[PDB]
Amino acid sequence: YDWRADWVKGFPIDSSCNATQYNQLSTGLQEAQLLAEHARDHTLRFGSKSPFFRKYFGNETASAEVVGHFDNVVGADKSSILFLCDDLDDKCKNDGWAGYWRGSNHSDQTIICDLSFVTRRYLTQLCSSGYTVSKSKTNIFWAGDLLHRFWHLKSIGQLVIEHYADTYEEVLELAQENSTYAVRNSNSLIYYALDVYAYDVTIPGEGCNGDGTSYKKSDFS
Amino acid sequence: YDWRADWVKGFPIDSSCNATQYNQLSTGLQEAQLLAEHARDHTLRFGSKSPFFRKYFGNETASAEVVGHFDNVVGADKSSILFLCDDLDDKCKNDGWAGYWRGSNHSDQTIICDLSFVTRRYLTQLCSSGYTVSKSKTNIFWAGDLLHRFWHLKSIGQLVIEHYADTYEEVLELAQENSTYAVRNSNSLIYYALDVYAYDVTIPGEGCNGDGTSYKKSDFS
Amino acid sequence: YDWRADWVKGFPIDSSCNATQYNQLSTGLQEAQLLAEHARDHTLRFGSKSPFFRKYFGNETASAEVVGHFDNVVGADKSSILFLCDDLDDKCKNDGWAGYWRGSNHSDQTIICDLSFVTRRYLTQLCSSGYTVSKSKTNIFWAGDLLHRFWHLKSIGQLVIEHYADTYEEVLELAQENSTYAVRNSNSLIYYALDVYAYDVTIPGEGCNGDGTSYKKSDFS
Amino acid sequence: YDWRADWVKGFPIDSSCNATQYNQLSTGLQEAQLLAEHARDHTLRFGSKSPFFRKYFGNETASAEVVGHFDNVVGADKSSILFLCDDLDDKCKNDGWAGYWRGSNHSDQTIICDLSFVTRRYLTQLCSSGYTVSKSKTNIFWAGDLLHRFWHLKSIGQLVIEHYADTYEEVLELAQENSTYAVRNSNSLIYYALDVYAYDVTIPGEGCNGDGTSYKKSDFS
Amino acid sequence: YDWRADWVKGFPIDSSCNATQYNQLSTGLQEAQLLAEHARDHTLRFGSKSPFFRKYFGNETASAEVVGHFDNVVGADKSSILFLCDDLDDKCKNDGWAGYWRGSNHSDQTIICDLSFVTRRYLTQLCSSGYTVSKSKTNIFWAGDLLHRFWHLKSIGQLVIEHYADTYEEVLELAQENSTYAVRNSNSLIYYALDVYAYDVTIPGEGCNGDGTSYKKSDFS
Amino acid sequence: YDWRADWVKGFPIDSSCNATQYNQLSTGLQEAQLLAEHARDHTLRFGSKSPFFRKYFGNETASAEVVGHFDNVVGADKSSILFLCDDLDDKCKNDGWAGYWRGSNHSDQTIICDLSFVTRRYLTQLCSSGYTVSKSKTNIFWAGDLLHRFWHLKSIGQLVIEHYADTYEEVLELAQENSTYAVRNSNSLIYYALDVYAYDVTIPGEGCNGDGTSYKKSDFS
Ligand SMILES: [Zn+2]
Ligand SMILES: [Zn+2]
Ligand SMILES: [Zn+2]
Ligand SMILES: [Zn+2]
Ligand SMILES: [Zn+2]
Ligand SMILES: [Zn+2]
């Protein structure tokens, strides 16, 4: 049994999407996977010697679960997962909804409404038009919005990633008060990934956190 | 700060070892890293759908820490680890000692005695001369002996992997009774890695566990 | 004298633009070059045997100048060209201006205003949100807007490409009336490139021209 | 319709030629294509900044048609072109005829007589045995002789390349007098290609023009 | 007849060997081929300018047959050679036998006994545990033992390599006295290969000959 | 001492040769090495199983010296060899002299006269214009003319290759009469190389020997 020949590592898309919807959805999925890969590489390189890891997960926390989560996002068998462009449950009618998870009956399926193809942004425009990591919402860009959808699936989240803290202040408090549940909080991982990508790639050496902190090379040792 | 050009992913060796000792220690370390990489790949491909994972870690356990540990072994900054061939603590004189960890004063240093160069075997001789995974000691080969030494280092183990169960039957009981602690047990990881390597590479489809179990393709779904 | 070593094929950007502006300007310039390369490949493969060429340039026109223009855009010495973000001529104050050519005193220089970083789209969103090649403006996307700016530079356009027809109907009439002058017309070239890219890549086999014409494989021979 | 998998970029040869004629004809065609490619690259790098372009095409002529002709020779669909080794019109009986074009009834076919396999040289012998570009005939080598045959075919010449000036002095006059017609003159392109190849590859920095001119690095700026 | 598509340069193994026997036999054969390749490269690089060649083959001997032997080992066609783990002659009961050549009736077949899978060592352990090239037997390692069995095969030895000198002193005397038969002597080639490999790879600059001779870079000129 | 970093495998040329002389001589030197490599590959693939080997070296002759001779030409240190275009010994004045060996005082040097640049042919014209291997002279082409010069050098020939037979009939008699000196005869090797190249590449399956022999696939077994 050569299981290396059936290994699917990309997110499948259903046939309910036409050409133009497919073109943008695939690009968004690729950008989300790229963000996850960069986060995993940063974690492997530094660990708890990084101020970002220290402030999002704890001062003396072990980095194995974070690496495992990001590596599961990057490479794993995505054969039961399907992304659809069809409103089967009749829920896109609500005001301000760009998609939803199908629920427990179909725990590996998710729906994308038409607002996503009008409001979501791409990674080349990060930290522009007044955007900051700590003051704006996390679903403005394709990558941070699809990372949130991934955590709800059964093959990726595995029924351990939940919503323990949502605001930036609550996330900072949970980092230092409860480090056991900080590594499985939904918003902490997204904040960490966005911050490290902005610091390493977009504006090298500065980032765009926007809360009054600046980190140098002496903070990494 | 380009930290991608400052990244060290191999285990350094001190100059106390001459050419002959270096030649064999390097090969042993490479074999240990290869075993860790294959274990990571098997975990990422299957998770809790494979019978080996179910029998060593639990029927419905999440595979994040297991991936993280082997990924830390494969890729991480080994800039503070050192392997020495010099008896700095006068402990190779004991009976049957092939090495020791230097302890809390030097948490990233290991010493190798002369017995290892005459007793340790190589991966091409697996499942031969009457060896079985479950009935023989885990330190007969270089890879399984060095995996156990990796778990004591501060940069790899991070003070969470310990000895909760050592015997095969105790490991089997821990897998089903206390699943939270059977992801940070030293012997469970080594048994899992040795069992999944021999089933996939050494004797494809059969393995050499030698306890009375046979698994087919229908058990992986 | 090895002139293959100091051969610059990309478009230089001045230091007046900060990191955020640079990130988007580079992507726009690369997309324009990619569009020109695809147009060149289509022209070389077919010539006057394709309906797009016949309806934009003439039924029996020779395809040499058309190939040469796109080849000059793709590969040539861009050593005297500079793109700036400073308003050195005090012209961005005008309503609806996204940039301007510096003129005959500085024939290889051009200025980009801030409206560009707010209204320009990317190639992954082509033929969406009601966009139509025949009915919309040619400067909605980054690539079509920068191709028009390329024709004004001294080293690319070489003082032969002008404005002979601007609307779609005028271009269509010029194709059949004056074939000698509809090979150095800016709008003709931009329309041709956008049409062939939309037909070949975005919606394979259909395109998004939106004028009531549909071409099959039998029209290419 | 994937037209990139149906693209033919080499010149086909009929089955009339035996094993020995094919071997030499293929090498001749390859050398002609290589010469065209080098001429295209020199034009793309320099334009009207090189003295060779200035002396063959005009002091301030635009380089788009010149690039397009050589690019058409290098890469284009050669699917209806055929080279034959069989006398079908009974014309090889003439004195000094090494081949001919089949005419308007068969606009994409050429015939090669037996003198070609006796009196044609290779690119490794350029500028030797007293040969000069200005004082010798242009059909002495395979590469310069097949380029002249390419201009007569319908899929490459496209009925725009003609004989307006044959001798070297008339070629030099046409460049300064009528630059509109000295871009579609058969002999100007061949002289240009041979001169730039000899200057760049055969004898770097000197060439073998044999006219009385010596160009330095300061002439290219 | 394209004979490049059916060219076999590896030694085939019969299906009478199970998985564990196959795994070790393949590694041994590969190591033997690697040793032969290194010997060929050393001979080509130096010839009679190296002290090892001088001391094993003669002070003024020509090096063509020595190169040809190792090249035949590395890259001749091996489609009629077979290695078997089946005792078809009842010769395993002889004390101390690890294998035997099948004889003149089957001149291209060899049998491997079970004693070989317990005693033979690997190239990573060369010059260790008190081993010296001059004083130990040549069949201690897989490569040296398997090289001696190739000289008996009809496709490799070709009925010209024999046993003229067996001990080290007789080999050293044959090198200086009878140079015409030193290039056809079985033990001389193995001694030469082991010496050059130990000097070049295992202990760079010193080797492990163990007879009191040390060579520097000035002896190679 | 890393001797793989200063390994020279091409034939050096002196500064006494101008640009055109260098251009022609380097190509001539490369063609001979290509021919030698093909001859070595044919010998390794077949040995005495091919009818070309049997007719030039003997029915049951071993093939190691032939392989070594061609391998020394293909890959070996050539740092003491030099080719010159200056007539230092005053010998480029006799009728029909295209070069000469400098003799025992300078045994690694060769002079090339001016007839070589006028008379020698290239491998693309093999078996044409009435050429046959057995009825024409050996030195008509660059490759066969330079293979004869290689055998006189001290670093390649090594004072064992001589002139024992010159005509085709004598060469054929020597193979069956005296097989020990046929493998070190200058003309036998060149005849064998030319024959196998013409049979394998120039006219696949037929060759151009021109003596009334035809070999099929059944002859190679
Ligand atoms: Zn959620
Ligand atoms: Zn322990
Ligand atoms: Zn304009
Ligand atoms: Zn003509
Ligand atoms: Zn023997
Ligand atoms: Zn001679």
Numbering used by the authors:
A (entry chain E), B (entry chain F), C (entry chain D), D (entry chain C), E (entry chain A), F (entry chain B): 31 to 251
The article reads:
In this study, we present cryo-EM structures of C. albicans Pra1 in the apo-state as well as in the zinc-bound state at 2.8 Å and 2.5 Å resolution, respectively.
From our cryo-EM structure of Pra1 prepared in the presence of 1 mM ZnSO4, we observe that the cryo-EM map is continuous amongst a cluster of three histidine residues (His 178, His 182 and His 193), which all point towards each other, consistent with the coordination of a metal ion. In this subunit (subunit B), the center of the zinc ion is equidistant to the center of the N3-nitrogen in the imidazole ring of each histidine residue. Although we generated two final maps for the Pra1:Zn2+ structure, one with c1 (no symmetry) and the other with three-fold c3 symmetry imposed, we analyzed and deposited the c1 map. In the c1 map, we are able to observe that the distances from the center of the zinc ion to the center of the N3-nitrogen in the histidine residue vary by subunit. For instance, in subunit A, the distance from the center of the zinc ion to the center of the N3-nitrogen of His 193 and His 182 is 2.3 Å. In contrast, the distance from the center of the zinc ion to the center of the N3-nitrogen of His 178 is 2.7 Å. In the context of the overall Pra1 architecture, these six Zn2+ binding sites are located on the outer face of the hexameric ring. The lack of metal ion coordination, and the change in pH, does not lead to global conformational changes in the resolved portions of Pra1. Indeed, a structural superposition of the hexamers in the presence and absence of Zn2+, shown in Supplementary Fig. 7, has an RMSD = 0.175 Å.
